[PDB]
């Protein structure tokens, strides 16, 4: 059956301020999707048609620079995946000569080195996010309105975002992570009772490492599920309140930035949760196979 | 007094990492309540009686140092409150000689200076929170357990917290802020239609300022409401899940830190939301009075 982690896309990291989260899946920042959404907003205002060039030059380059940064950490990624494959697979551990304690410490060191690399190589890209944001605000000032800025475009997009939000079975995600977190706790509780009786070298270490990784991925799923829930609740609360006809231009700037980043979060968190969904299912199959091996060793002991 | 804000406790500020929130209400940080909760956890484990002294000395002193640090910003607070009372009250504006544009600018400068003071004077205290947290983690290592650490105390406290969580009407908080936010947006829209019809600049400026402050306080209410709901949902999710009877010592450490900080967030946010609820209501009374003064002027040509 399944016993080898082929993909470790589940690692992410946030910056020190916890404003930006870096993912191994492109566009790597949710903020790229906001720049894509503003391209849709700007097409309805002829006063800001220059953003078409800002998007082609600044926004696309930022995406590729983010992809380039992730690619710089690719050899750390392969080294980390090589350690994971040994630590999770007793058969692969038996083909080398290092001890499990040594490989475990190298795993923690390479894990933080890889995650640290994802952030460090993207710091200048993070600064570019603010500069393109400020460039967008300055571009928005060229609108031919000041205290009577129309909100039709703003309210048209909220309605469009609400139907896209219905295309995500939010109850399925809650039910899935609830069962998995309890299945995870039951697994660890079963391992605790078995270890109290026997020492099963290699096999028992492997199943604990996989469970430890499972716990990390569970935490990642809950994080990204909380953000997509928050984003949908905010946009929905706007649609259930009063709808002003006209606002000032500085207010319309905040409006576009508000719904634009919320839809970006939703779009970004969806593909992240889908990846994390597959990673959890994959880790569980490894645990299942290892657990059957562990019960066989328990029988021959007693 | 009529159209007079007497309390400006609604201002708060977070640190750059957004891990610590500094409030003008004692204990100024929710982390103090966690230290108070661990004092209850430690009473069930004779191996860690030393925390009785750590709490009495380090924790209480941190509270008093936090209170003193906030006190350093009192001169800025009085200046800021003085500007608020002028900007919100047309009668008090007419009794002085500064222009409304200059007073608005001084407000924005003093507001940021006061909020920045609340954080800057508390930076050493924020570091002391980390010292006490690490000292607690090191103290927990003295437990006479390794792979068989009982979770009886952990589950006894979760039961207690759930009873306390039900004493907070979350739906009342939600229904209030959503109706209040809608009334706020209607007030703004009403002024946009009204100001086109009359030249009442003194009154209109005061309404716009009070509504400007109302917007800030609404965002504060929403921030603290989200935190307290997250904390209740996390602790409730623990109760609805599998309940292992024994865990490892490092797992028990994270157990105590998890529910302790979540309950601390619950206690802290409740008193914050109650203060913000009163502040929003008081700002709305000022808007009601000013709208009544505005409609009176509209009647007389």
Residue numbers in the entry:
A (entry chain B): 28 to 329
B (entry chain A): 28 to 328
Give sentences from the paper.
Among these markers, the P. vivax reticulocyte-binding protein 2b (PvRBP2b), a member of the PvRBP family of protein adhesins, produces the top prediction for dormant P. vivax infection. PvRBP2b binds to human transferrin receptor 1 (TfR1) to mediate entry into reticulocytes. The surface of the N-terminal domain of the natural protein PvRBP2b (residues 169–470, PvRBP2b169-470) is a mostly positively charged α-helical protein comprising ten α-helices and two very short antiparallel β-sheets. We sought to design stabilized variants of PvRBP2b, under stringent conditions of minimally perturbing the solvent-accessible surfaces to maintain its antigenicity profile.
We designed six variants with the standard phylogenetic strategy (encoding 20–37 mutations from WT; designs WHT2476–WHT2481) and three with the ProteinMPNN-based PSSMs that exhibited fewer mutations (17–26; designs WHT2482, WHT2483, and WHT2484). To determine whether the designs retained the structure of the parental protein, we determined the crystal structures of WHT2483 and WHT2484 (19 and 26 mutations, respectively) to 2.4 Å and 1.9 Å resolution, respectively. The best, bearing 19 core mutations relative to PvRBP2b, expressed 16-fold greater amounts (up to 11 mg/l), and had 14 °C higher thermal tolerance than the parental protein. After the three-step purification process, WHT2482, WHT2483, and WHT2484 showed increased protein yields up to 9-, 16-, and 10-fold, respectively, compared to parental PvRBP2b169-470. WHT2482, WHT2483, and WHT2484 had final yields up to 6, 11, and 7 mg/l of E. coli culture, respectively, compared to 0.7 mg per liter for the parental protein. The main surface change is the reduction in positive charge in a patch on both WHT2483 and WHT2484 compared to the parental construct due to the introduction of the charge-swap mutation Arg418Glu. This is reflected in the overall reduction in the calculated pI from 9.2 for parent to 8.9 and 8.8 for WHT2483 and WHT2484, respectively. Comparison of the binding footprints of the human antibody panel with the mutations introduced in WHT2483 and WHT2484 reveals that the binding surfaces are largely conserved, with few of the introduced mutations being within the antibody bound surface of parental PvRBP2b169-470. There are three introduced mutations which fall within the antibody binding footprints, these are Lys248Leu and Met324Phe which are present in WHT2484, as well as Gln378Leu which is present in both WHT2483 and WHT2484. The interaction of 241242 with Gln378 is mediated through the peptide backbone which would remain unchanged in the stabilized designs. Our results show that WHT2482, WHT2483, and WHT2484 bound all nine human antibodies with affinity in the low nanomolar range.
